[PDB]
């Protein structure tokens, strides 16, 4: 299947409680593999997946140096953004950035990403052509002109088309026993009476990887989109994910309802019914 690598930066100011905290985490697909935290006793980029541990000391030194430099520059960026919005020194603010590459089964670049948000609001994004930016407002226009003068887009294009996909390909091979292994959901339907007239049918998917999954209820083969309660896909803690979908059915009519499950780990899609 297709794959992605993403890094997530978060910088958080906290006036009166020290300098802004800087966090970086890296993912391949839905597997976290590195973390950096400027609040740590000895800040270093650290492994969070077994297949990255084999990288040598020059790898960990480079990622740590970049992240320590980022701690300083994202603190300056937070000061800059505060001024762009005429904001006081007393409030706490958040700067977030996420970037990375998507590749297809041949490992070729499908598209690159770099976008930033300030206090949860989209701020600036590298366009899909990897050559220009979309600035959300007149503050982000200042950043855009800075980055244009520094030739930033050309640096991003070179990373996203080059080292990003090269490192992702290496990670996929080093971690192929997990990163390239799709674990199918274990599925079942439970039944929960509400009253004499109604009951809940809940269709469960457990233990699956990656997190992408489709869970739907049909009644007489018609999708019950508006009437299905879908919880957010949630982590189990063992790399796998869980999800369920629920519908309220008239008592006695349970057999008109079917649960349909799609996942990359499944040879063929699944149709499930309440067993009784």
């Amino acid at each position: 299947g297709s794959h992605s690598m993403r890094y997530f930066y978060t910088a958080m100011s906290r006036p009166g409680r020290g300098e802004p905290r800087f966090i970086a985490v890296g993912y391949v697909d839905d597997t976290q593999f590195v973390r950096f935290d400027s609040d740590a006793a000895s800040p270093r980029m650290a492994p969070r997946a077994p297949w990255i541990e084999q990288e040598g000391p020059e790898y960990w030194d480079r990622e740590t140096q970049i992240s320590k430099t980022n701690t300083q520059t994202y603190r300056e960026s937070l000061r800059n953004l505060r001024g762009y919005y005429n904001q006081s020194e007393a409030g706490s603010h958040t700067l977030q950035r996420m970037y990375g590459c998507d590749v297809g089964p041949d490992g070729r670049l499908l598209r690159g990403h770099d976008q930033s948000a300030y206090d949860g609001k989209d701020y600036i994004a590298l366009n899909e052509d990897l050559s220009s930016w979309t600035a959300a407002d007149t503050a982000a226009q200042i950043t855009q002109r800075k980055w244009e003068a520094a030739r930033e887009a050309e640096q991003w294009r070179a990373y996203l088309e080059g080292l990003c996909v090269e490192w992702l390909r290496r990670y996929l091979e080093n971690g192929k026993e997990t990163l390239q292994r799709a674990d199918p959901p274990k599925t079942h339907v439970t039944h929960h009476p509400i009253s004499d007239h109604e009951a809940t049918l809940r269709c469960w998917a457990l233990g699956f990887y990656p997190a992408e999954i489709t869970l739907t209820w049909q009644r007489d083969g018609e999708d019950q989109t508006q009437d299905t309660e879908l919880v957010e896909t949630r982590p189990a803690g063992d790399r796998t994910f869980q999800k369920w979908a629920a519908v309220v059915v008239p008592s006695g009519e349970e057999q008109r309802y079917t649960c349909h499950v799609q996942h990359e780990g499944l040879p063929k899609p699944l149709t499930l019914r309440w067993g009784g």
Binding site: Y7, A24, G26, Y59, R62, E63, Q65, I66, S67, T69, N70, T73, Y74, E76, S77, N80, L81, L95, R97, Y99, S116, I124, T143, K146, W147, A150, E152, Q155, W156, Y159, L163, C164, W167
Partner: peptide, 9 residues
């Protein structure tokens, strides 16, 4: 692996 250290916003 990370892109090189960022320049300021």
């Amino acid at each position: 692996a990370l892109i090189g250290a960022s320049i300021c916003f």
